Amino acid sequence: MLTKFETKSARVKGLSFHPKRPWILTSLHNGVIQLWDYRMCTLIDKFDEHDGPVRGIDFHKQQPLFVSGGDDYKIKVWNYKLRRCLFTLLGHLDYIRTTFFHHEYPWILSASDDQTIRVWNWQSRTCVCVLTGHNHYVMCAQFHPSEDLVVSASLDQTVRVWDISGLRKKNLSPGAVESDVRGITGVDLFGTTDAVVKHVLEGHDRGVNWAAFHPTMPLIVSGADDRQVKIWRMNESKAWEVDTCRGHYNNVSCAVFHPRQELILSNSEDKSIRVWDMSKRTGVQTFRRDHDRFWVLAAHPNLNLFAAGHDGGMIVFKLERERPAYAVHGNMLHYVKDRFLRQLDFNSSKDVAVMQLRSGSKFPVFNMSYNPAENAVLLCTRASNLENSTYDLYTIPKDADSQNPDAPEGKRSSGLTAVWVARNRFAVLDRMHSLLIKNLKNEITKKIQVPNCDEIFYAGTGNLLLRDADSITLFDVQQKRTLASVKISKVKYVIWSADMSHVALLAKHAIVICNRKLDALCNIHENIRVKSGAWDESGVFIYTTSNHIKYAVTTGDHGIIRTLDLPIYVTRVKGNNVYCLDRECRPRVLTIDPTEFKFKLALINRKYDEVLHMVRNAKLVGQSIIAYLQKKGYPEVALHFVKDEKTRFSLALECGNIEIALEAAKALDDKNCWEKLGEVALLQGNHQIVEMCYQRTKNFDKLSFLYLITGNLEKLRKMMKIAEIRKDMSGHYQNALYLGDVSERVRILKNCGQKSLAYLSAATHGLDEEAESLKETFDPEKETIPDIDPNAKLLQPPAPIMPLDTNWPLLTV
Amino acid sequence: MDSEPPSEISLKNDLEKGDVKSKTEALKKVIIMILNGEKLPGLLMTIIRFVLPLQDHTIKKLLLVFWEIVPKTTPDGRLLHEMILVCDAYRKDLQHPNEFIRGSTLRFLCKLKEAELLEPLMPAIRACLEHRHSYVRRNAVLAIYTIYRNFEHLIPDAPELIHDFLVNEKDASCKRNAFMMLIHADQDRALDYLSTCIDQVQTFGDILQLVIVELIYKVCHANPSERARFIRCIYNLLQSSSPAVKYEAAGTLVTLSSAPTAIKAAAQCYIDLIIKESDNNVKLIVLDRLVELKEHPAHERVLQDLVMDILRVLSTPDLEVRKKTLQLALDLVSSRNVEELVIVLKKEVIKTNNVSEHEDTDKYRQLLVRTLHSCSVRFPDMAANVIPVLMEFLSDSNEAAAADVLEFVREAIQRFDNLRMLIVEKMLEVFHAIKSVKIYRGALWILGEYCSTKEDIQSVMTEVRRSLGEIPIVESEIKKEAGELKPEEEITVGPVQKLVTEMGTYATQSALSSSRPTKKEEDRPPLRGFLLDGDFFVAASLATTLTKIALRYVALVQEKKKQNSFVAEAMLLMATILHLGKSDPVYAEAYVHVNQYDIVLDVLVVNQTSDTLQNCTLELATLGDLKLVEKPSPLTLAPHDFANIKANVKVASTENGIIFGNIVYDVSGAASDRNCVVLSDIHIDIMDYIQPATCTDAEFRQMWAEFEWENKVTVNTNMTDLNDYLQHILKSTNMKCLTPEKALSGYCGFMAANLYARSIFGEDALANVSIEKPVHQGPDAAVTGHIRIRAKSQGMALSLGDKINLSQKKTSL
């Protein structure tokens, strides 16, 4: 037993399990009612609906509501989504012990401690029916999964089976016209206290406090004020079917059947919760949890967990399996047993499930294993780890125990374990708790064989006969020898391709998919360890790593195919579909699409024309179509998507033709881009394009520098003026030098107020007159000879080239 | 009603009731719920109906209140018009004989930048054109400016209405009370008028004139406002070497550190700075002005030095002030730090002079000897001062008091070769009363090195050699030491040769000499006897023996760089060390895209189903430290809809109460039980939530000490250095590689990174990545690195441990 949930609330008189969802309601003696998401751990609601004890609690899930009944003497209906009181109705004139909801119309049943249980119709003004019989308290009313009948447990020493659509109960003799009820000695003795009798049941244990059913059985068990539990047939009122379970020490508050085990779980107002044998009907074992007394019990009609309410609070407790072994063939999931019986196949986003016949497991699973050709299933039965049990083989597409006993298919024989192994019809078995090999002599092997033995490892489960004592050991087909042992880190699972020759093992990042023995074919790219993923024999690997099913790869493409609304494990890939089942084991299926897959299959084979159609909004994203296609240094993909002003910018430098850059740079509304593309421009060779860019980034001085280098003199002058005003002394200043005469500087420098510098520059060119002007306007003294000349010839022949390097030739490829 | 968001039904009732008090209270209750930010439009017709025309100020004032904080939003009782229920009968309010209602009305009306009230606010200046108070005229200049701000930057607001429309600002200057709402964008004539007003000021008003127009030619002209600007203006006209002597800055400055010692400590700093600007060597840092309080005339009465003595501190004022003060003595006067540190140290270090400077705790005493002594090592002049003071330290003549003294002085002799010959005779004296290691160690070293100088040695050593105390470390120090210097230059009943005999016995041999040594078995395991035993080639003589070693100093020994030094005065250093200096089916497909630096989670939402999913809404959630920067906003997910919807993503937020998993993404649709479904887009980790932070070597070291990091793993793909994979990956688990903890050479040179983070997890995170990259013939495991990790309870330690391996995700839809 595992404790899923345990919240101390104080004395819970009523407890009920939601049939739709894995929720619990508790009604407390403190007058508070609480609705719990016991799996999620999130309080849904909490209401103080009455000062004193609220003894009865129910789900009213026909429309999303819960119903409570309290000692206010009322049955009240409550919203769990809007937290408001939907409707209020007069159940009775005393304590509402248990309440039950009709699924016919919004009718509500309340069982009370004033000896009647009544059903009331809100939708109309009518109280449709009152069901009477008790002479002392109806402690409990309980639904079967059909809505026609209910059972009530009362402390007048009976259990009364009622009809809710009926006036009290509904029955009529076909052998007589007279009423079924007799107040006289007939073939049984009872009073006149009913309209008619469909079924008056024993409840004698000095009154039964509660009654409840197994979800798939008409049988009911009742706990009563004494110290016994008595199991009843409510479908016949037999007294040759009723066995008494003895173990408890004081008044048993309830007893209900465990849906998922072959035991009956009871709880009593002593201090113990006792567990009972349901093939022997006496106490297997007693547990004390020391929360003292238990006044309520509950068994899940959604066959999830199990719960019992105590005087400290309640516990929902777990007797279920986690991470089961499974394999998918074409449309059949085969898995190892979990709650809610056998399920699987169909759906794709819903948490509903539905049945198909593909049970790999139909008996206690010692082993469940697929054939490597996927044609048989081996199920090993009668448990044990001694040296013998039974093993039953089933056919894989549709599974029975035996298909026919008169046909080779579906046979059984002895063997502690038998598990299939490669050569694709073979199996290896343990029948002495050694490794023995199994043949039948042609077809998938069903018959027990004793030759060949080993002295290492110990029988268990597998798919290649896994055995453990310190590692997971693969065993051979026809040899006693260990084929190989694997040791690695796991996430509690073993993943098969679908063929059970091969195995996938989980590692520190993702999963690795491997062949028979331990040989690693490839590694799935993905940062974290996947929960499960399976390969369609190889190639197309589909996996779950969250709430979505995505392909690790198909033909070098990468895609997330679709998301489901639940966390899940891939069951495996056999066919185009991928099939999944989770811990609770609800299915999702998903067709492998030609969405993400076609697009990149096409882009890889350099098709852009194909790819435009392929572009859809089921796969567009942001960077797999509209900006992933700007990721070629010799643009190809890049040419195709260029819609973003940034992608356009990028495209241009990758070609080296910046004509497009300037425009993208423009449409990026930014200077930085113009200077950087201008530099790239100078690199392709041509300075016209550089000028334009550099001019608008305002790098007139860079231009001034560039310009004799380029051999322009006309353009070089334009730079000088528009750098004059900036007082860029390594911009405006340059150009005068660069033309044969220096006069440009002389004026700019005059405006700077740098009269000295202006004179020196001018004077040397033999423009002593201008040099003198500067001296005269400002401080004179021009006579001085610095570490540089102040009057020696400056003349330079400017640019001998007739065509300039703004006109640098180009062809462009 | 402090904050009660559902109470709007009661407020409507309370708002009209025939009792004026109730109405006022109601309207008041509305105000307080809106201000907090809660529900308010239901009420509007009720609110508006009583109050509208009236001159009765309180309700009017209340309604006037509610029109500046929500008028636009509320529309039941107002709707949209030019003369709304905010102002239609508030033209009456503006034109009442009572100044208060008019004034109030004017004030809110003009305050709004509302365009549905633009016309009614314009002649609203009428209400305050007549100025019954200073408040009325100020209210007017602020309201005209607020009108100007509200779309009337042209002729609707600029001239006069009858006295103000943007002209109160002019009028105020010459009127009895000033206030200029004219700070920006307003009449030039008023700006000019404010200047005139500087003279004819009104003090509150002067702060308003002054924010607009500052700098005076004068000293002042009066009032705090002018005065406050004035110190700014003064700092301009003399920037040079701080303010030096703080101006009118002094008044605010004290409050800036009201907690309480820190003000004095600061004040002391400024006063020291101010005294003089010295040489400004190592801890001689006094700036400000060279002469302004001088230093050191011999005719100055009662001198500068009296204030200088405060700064020399033992703690003479309290600890915060102490740390500042010791640095400050050093700073005004020394040679560097050395001079004034020796004086200061002489006072602090242990003596027989004062017993208020000696203590029997050995480390502090020792440290104080080392601090005094480091000054000599720094600077020569100090050697001469130190040795006689050291002998006074010894004179205490407790076992331990001698001991500490002997230990440093012996180091000083290693530096200071045959200069401290004189000390030896003093040093022997207290060596006889003995209960500790330290005394034996040190004494044996002085007496040993110094042998030529003295001749006493059999007698001194021998009382101790046959005396007891604690003797582990004694062995090591005596072993290298006892023979040294001059081969036969002693004799009392054991010459220098007896000493070499002794020296050898004490090291690890055996010999009758000095009435046998105390112990022979050496100190910590590596040291042993043997090196020295081999040694003494030439019997205790300066050559290439113990003497050589003794009269030489290991490596460089200079300054206060901590090479035979300790770095200032021992008490001040503790504080400096402390200073760390830390700086409903649904289908999803998804990829993350970045265009023009916009980071977005691309999602495509797919309805593969024929079924209805209308009611479709899309939301991205805030989980914890993950947040939506804008959810996907399309109403998509309809019958056979493919859509691309973009959800923008952030990584940095504050924890929300909903789940803390990967990324939650929510699509809504038709269904009433699961109207909202959670389905996933691709991976985001728990690691995001960590917040990056950094450490320095001191913070790293402190944290190393603070909490354990023994935990290590070796991570593959740490083959590479710190910079490459390891930094990038460490970054993603919000970590950063900072400072080293390595020790590289030709045999050493693992790369070491000191990591830090301060996780939003109630822990920090730290680690050291050691990269085992071979720098030896026997590497650990070759290339790979072992990361030694922690976090504050090592719950994030583990994140560091595995997120430094690998990490990559991609898709290509």
PDB file of N, CA, C and O in Angstrom, chain A residues 388-422:
ATOM      1  N   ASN A 388       8.630 -23.556 -11.435  1.00  0.00           N
ATOM      2  CA  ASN A 388       7.517 -23.897 -12.225  1.00  0.00           C
ATOM      3  C   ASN A 388       6.342 -23.009 -11.965  1.00  0.00           C
ATOM      4  O   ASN A 388       6.175 -22.537 -10.858  1.00  0.00           O
ATOM      5  N   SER A 389       5.595 -22.883 -13.043  1.00  0.00           N
ATOM      6  CA  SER A 389       4.330 -22.170 -13.049  1.00  0.00           C
ATOM      7  C   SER A 389       3.630 -22.572 -14.286  1.00  0.00           C
ATOM      8  O   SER A 389       3.825 -23.674 -14.759  1.00  0.00           O
ATOM      9  N   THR A 390       2.809 -21.722 -14.918  1.00  0.00           N
ATOM     10  CA  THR A 390       2.250 -22.058 -16.213  1.00  0.00           C
ATOM     11  C   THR A 390       2.545 -20.914 -17.109  1.00  0.00           C
ATOM     12  O   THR A 390       2.831 -19.816 -16.648  1.00  0.00           O
ATOM     13  N   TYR A 391       2.588 -21.097 -18.446  1.00  0.00           N
ATOM     14  CA  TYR A 391       2.775 -20.014 -19.351  1.00  0.00           C
ATOM     15  C   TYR A 391       1.759 -20.320 -20.401  1.00  0.00           C
ATOM     16  O   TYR A 391       1.581 -21.461 -20.810  1.00  0.00           O
ATOM     17  N   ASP A 392       1.070 -19.257 -20.819  1.00  0.00           N
ATOM     18  CA  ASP A 392      -0.004 -19.293 -21.797  1.00  0.00           C
ATOM     19  C   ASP A 392       0.435 -18.331 -22.765  1.00  0.00           C
ATOM     20  O   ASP A 392       0.912 -17.247 -22.433  1.00  0.00           O
ATOM     21  N   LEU A 393       0.335 -18.655 -24.063  1.00  0.00           N
ATOM     22  CA  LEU A 393       0.715 -17.920 -25.257  1.00  0.00           C
ATOM     23  C   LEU A 393      -0.553 -17.548 -25.888  1.00  0.00           C
ATOM     24  O   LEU A 393      -1.497 -18.326 -25.833  1.00  0.00           O
ATOM     25  N   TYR A 394      -0.549 -16.329 -26.469  1.00  0.00           N
ATOM     26  CA  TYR A 394      -1.748 -15.861 -27.074  1.00  0.00           C
ATOM     27  C   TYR A 394      -1.288 -15.423 -28.458  1.00  0.00           C
ATOM     28  O   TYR A 394      -0.149 -15.121 -28.703  1.00  0.00           O
ATOM     29  N   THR A 395      -2.255 -15.315 -29.420  1.00  0.00           N
ATOM     30  CA  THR A 395      -2.017 -14.701 -30.715  1.00  0.00           C
ATOM     31  C   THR A 395      -2.141 -13.225 -30.526  1.00  0.00           C
ATOM     32  O   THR A 395      -3.161 -12.727 -29.970  1.00  0.00           O
ATOM     33  N   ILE A 396      -1.145 -12.506 -31.071  1.00  0.00           N
ATOM     34  CA  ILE A 396      -1.022 -11.058 -31.051  1.00  0.00           C
ATOM     35  C   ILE A 396      -2.059 -10.166 -31.586  1.00  0.00           C
ATOM     36  O   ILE A 396      -2.235  -9.162 -30.939  1.00  0.00           O
ATOM     37  N   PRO A 397      -2.790 -10.418 -32.717  1.00  0.00           N
ATOM     38  CA  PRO A 397      -3.752  -9.393 -33.247  1.00  0.00           C
ATOM     39  C   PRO A 397      -4.983  -9.296 -32.348  1.00  0.00           C
ATOM     40  O   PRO A 397      -5.536  -8.218 -32.155  1.00  0.00           O
ATOM     41  N   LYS A 398      -5.515 -10.482 -31.829  1.00  0.00           N
ATOM     42  CA  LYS A 398      -6.711 -10.619 -30.991  1.00  0.00           C
ATOM     43  C   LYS A 398      -6.302 -11.782 -30.040  1.00  0.00           C
ATOM     44  O   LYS A 398      -5.671 -12.747 -30.495  1.00  0.00           O
ATOM     45  N   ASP A 399      -6.468 -11.566 -28.785  1.00  0.00           N
ATOM     46  CA  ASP A 399      -5.869 -12.414 -27.741  1.00  0.00           C
ATOM     47  C   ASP A 399      -6.937 -13.087 -26.962  1.00  0.00           C
ATOM     48  O   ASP A 399      -7.899 -12.403 -26.653  1.00  0.00           O
ATOM     49  N   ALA A 400      -6.742 -14.420 -26.692  1.00  0.00           N
ATOM     50  CA  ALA A 400      -7.718 -15.116 -25.887  1.00  0.00           C
ATOM     51  C   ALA A 400      -6.686 -15.796 -25.030  1.00  0.00           C
ATOM     52  O   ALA A 400      -5.503 -15.584 -25.139  1.00  0.00           O
ATOM     53  N   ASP A 401      -7.119 -16.743 -24.179  1.00  0.00           N
ATOM     54  CA  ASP A 401      -6.254 -17.577 -23.351  1.00  0.00           C
ATOM     55  C   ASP A 401      -5.806 -18.706 -24.143  1.00  0.00           C
ATOM     56  O   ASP A 401      -4.629 -18.928 -24.489  1.00  0.00           O
ATOM     57  N   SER A 402      -6.848 -19.354 -24.714  1.00  0.00           N
ATOM     58  CA  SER A 402      -6.592 -20.250 -25.838  1.00  0.00           C
ATOM     59  C   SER A 402      -7.594 -19.808 -26.910  1.00  0.00           C
ATOM     60  O   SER A 402      -8.670 -19.352 -26.556  1.00  0.00           O
ATOM     61  N   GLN A 403      -7.092 -19.890 -28.118  1.00  0.00           N
ATOM     62  CA  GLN A 403      -7.788 -19.557 -29.299  1.00  0.00           C
ATOM     63  C   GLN A 403      -8.806 -20.639 -29.647  1.00  0.00           C
ATOM     64  O   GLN A 403      -9.990 -20.375 -29.788  1.00  0.00           O
ATOM     65  N   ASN A 404      -8.306 -21.853 -29.527  1.00  0.00           N
ATOM     66  CA  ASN A 404      -9.068 -23.081 -29.605  1.00  0.00           C
ATOM     67  C   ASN A 404      -8.186 -24.019 -28.893  1.00  0.00           C
ATOM     68  O   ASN A 404      -6.958 -23.815 -28.870  1.00  0.00           O
ATOM     69  N   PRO A 405      -8.676 -25.076 -28.147  1.00  0.00           N
ATOM     70  CA  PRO A 405      -7.798 -25.980 -27.423  1.00  0.00           C
ATOM     71  C   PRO A 405      -7.417 -27.049 -28.412  1.00  0.00           C
ATOM     72  O   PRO A 405      -6.504 -27.827 -28.043  1.00  0.00           O
ATOM     73  N   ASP A 406      -8.140 -27.093 -29.564  1.00  0.00           N
ATOM     74  CA  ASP A 406      -8.011 -28.172 -30.594  1.00  0.00           C
ATOM     75  C   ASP A 406      -7.048 -27.712 -31.706  1.00  0.00           C
ATOM     76  O   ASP A 406      -6.865 -28.456 -32.696  1.00  0.00           O
ATOM     77  N   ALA A 407      -6.435 -26.537 -31.558  1.00  0.00           N
ATOM     78  CA  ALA A 407      -5.547 -25.868 -32.502  1.00  0.00           C
ATOM     79  C   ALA A 407      -4.261 -25.504 -31.756  1.00  0.00           C
ATOM     80  O   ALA A 407      -4.270 -25.299 -30.537  1.00  0.00           O
ATOM     81  N   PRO A 408      -3.075 -25.567 -32.447  1.00  0.00           N
ATOM     82  CA  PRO A 408      -1.680 -25.360 -31.944  1.00  0.00           C
ATOM     83  C   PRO A 408      -1.565 -23.975 -31.352  1.00  0.00           C
ATOM     84  O   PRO A 408      -0.677 -23.812 -30.498  1.00  0.00           O
ATOM     85  N   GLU A 409      -2.433 -23.072 -31.812  1.00  0.00           N
ATOM     86  CA  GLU A 409      -2.411 -21.688 -31.358  1.00  0.00           C
ATOM     87  C   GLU A 409      -3.076 -21.551 -30.000  1.00  0.00           C
ATOM     88  O   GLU A 409      -4.080 -22.148 -29.693  1.00  0.00           O
ATOM     89  N   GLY A 410      -2.558 -20.710 -29.115  1.00  0.00           N
ATOM     90  CA  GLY A 410      -3.130 -20.428 -27.782  1.00  0.00           C
ATOM     91  C   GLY A 410      -2.843 -21.518 -26.798  1.00  0.00           C
ATOM     92  O   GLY A 410      -3.499 -21.590 -25.786  1.00  0.00           O
ATOM     93  N   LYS A 411      -1.833 -22.491 -27.007  1.00  0.00           N
ATOM     94  CA  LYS A 411      -1.547 -23.577 -26.098  1.00  0.00           C
ATOM     95  C   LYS A 411      -0.828 -22.991 -24.889  1.00  0.00           C
ATOM     96  O   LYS A 411      -0.543 -21.781 -24.917  1.00  0.00           O
ATOM     97  N   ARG A 412      -0.653 -23.829 -23.900  1.00  0.00           N
ATOM     98  CA  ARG A 412      -0.059 -23.504 -22.648  1.00  0.00           C
ATOM     99  C   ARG A 412       0.741 -24.700 -22.324  1.00  0.00           C
ATOM    100  O   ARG A 412       0.446 -25.850 -22.739  1.00  0.00           O
ATOM    101  N   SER A 413       1.719 -24.526 -21.477  1.00  0.00           N
ATOM    102  CA  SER A 413       2.472 -25.592 -20.864  1.00  0.00           C
ATOM    103  C   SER A 413       3.140 -25.012 -19.644  1.00  0.00           C
ATOM    104  O   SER A 413       2.822 -23.896 -19.283  1.00  0.00           O
ATOM    105  N   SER A 414       3.976 -25.817 -18.979  1.00  0.00           N
ATOM    106  CA  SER A 414       4.616 -25.433 -17.771  1.00  0.00           C
ATOM    107  C   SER A 414       5.902 -24.718 -18.123  1.00  0.00           C
ATOM    108  O   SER A 414       6.489 -24.970 -19.143  1.00  0.00           O
ATOM    109  N   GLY A 415       6.345 -23.880 -17.191  1.00  0.00           N
ATOM    110  CA  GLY A 415       7.607 -23.235 -17.271  1.00  0.00           C
ATOM    111  C   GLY A 415       7.395 -22.030 -16.402  1.00  0.00           C
ATOM    112  O   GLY A 415       6.267 -21.470 -16.464  1.00  0.00           O
ATOM    113  N   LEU A 416       8.373 -21.826 -15.537  1.00  0.00           N
ATOM    114  CA  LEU A 416       8.375 -20.794 -14.496  1.00  0.00           C
ATOM    115  C   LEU A 416       8.250 -19.497 -15.146  1.00  0.00           C
ATOM    116  O   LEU A 416       7.391 -18.692 -14.768  1.00  0.00           O
ATOM    117  N   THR A 417       9.011 -19.316 -16.199  1.00  0.00           N
ATOM    118  CA  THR A 417       8.884 -18.141 -17.018  1.00  0.00           C
ATOM    119  C   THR A 417       9.101 -18.734 -18.387  1.00  0.00           C
ATOM    120  O   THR A 417       9.808 -19.748 -18.508  1.00  0.00           O
ATOM    121  N   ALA A 418       8.675 -18.026 -19.463  1.00  0.00           N
ATOM    122  CA  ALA A 418       9.095 -18.364 -20.810  1.00  0.00           C
ATOM    123  C   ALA A 418       9.097 -16.970 -21.419  1.00  0.00           C
ATOM    124  O   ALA A 418       8.304 -16.108 -21.061  1.00  0.00           O
ATOM    125  N   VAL A 419      10.055 -16.654 -22.264  1.00  0.00           N
ATOM    126  CA  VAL A 419      10.081 -15.314 -22.803  1.00  0.00           C
ATOM    127  C   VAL A 419      10.610 -15.454 -24.206  1.00  0.00           C
ATOM    128  O   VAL A 419      11.445 -16.265 -24.369  1.00  0.00           O
ATOM    129  N   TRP A 420      10.033 -14.664 -25.190  1.00  0.00           N
ATOM    130  CA  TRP A 420      10.498 -14.887 -26.500  1.00  0.00           C
ATOM    131  C   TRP A 420      11.891 -14.258 -26.721  1.00  0.00           C
ATOM    132  O   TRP A 420      12.281 -13.468 -25.918  1.00  0.00           O
ATOM    133  N   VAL A 421      12.617 -14.846 -27.792  1.00  0.00           N
ATOM    134  CA  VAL A 421      13.953 -14.439 -28.121  1.00  0.00           C
ATOM    135  C   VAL A 421      14.050 -14.633 -29.606  1.00  0.00           C
ATOM    136  O   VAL A 421      13.325 -15.325 -30.278  1.00  0.00           O
ATOM    137  N   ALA A 422      15.066 -13.939 -30.190  1.00  0.00           N
ATOM    138  CA  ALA A 422      15.365 -13.884 -31.668  1.00  0.00           C
ATOM    139  C   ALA A 422      15.591 -15.239 -32.257  1.00  0.00           C
ATOM    140  O   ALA A 422      15.677 -16.243 -31.615  1.00  0.00           O
TER     141      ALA A 422
END
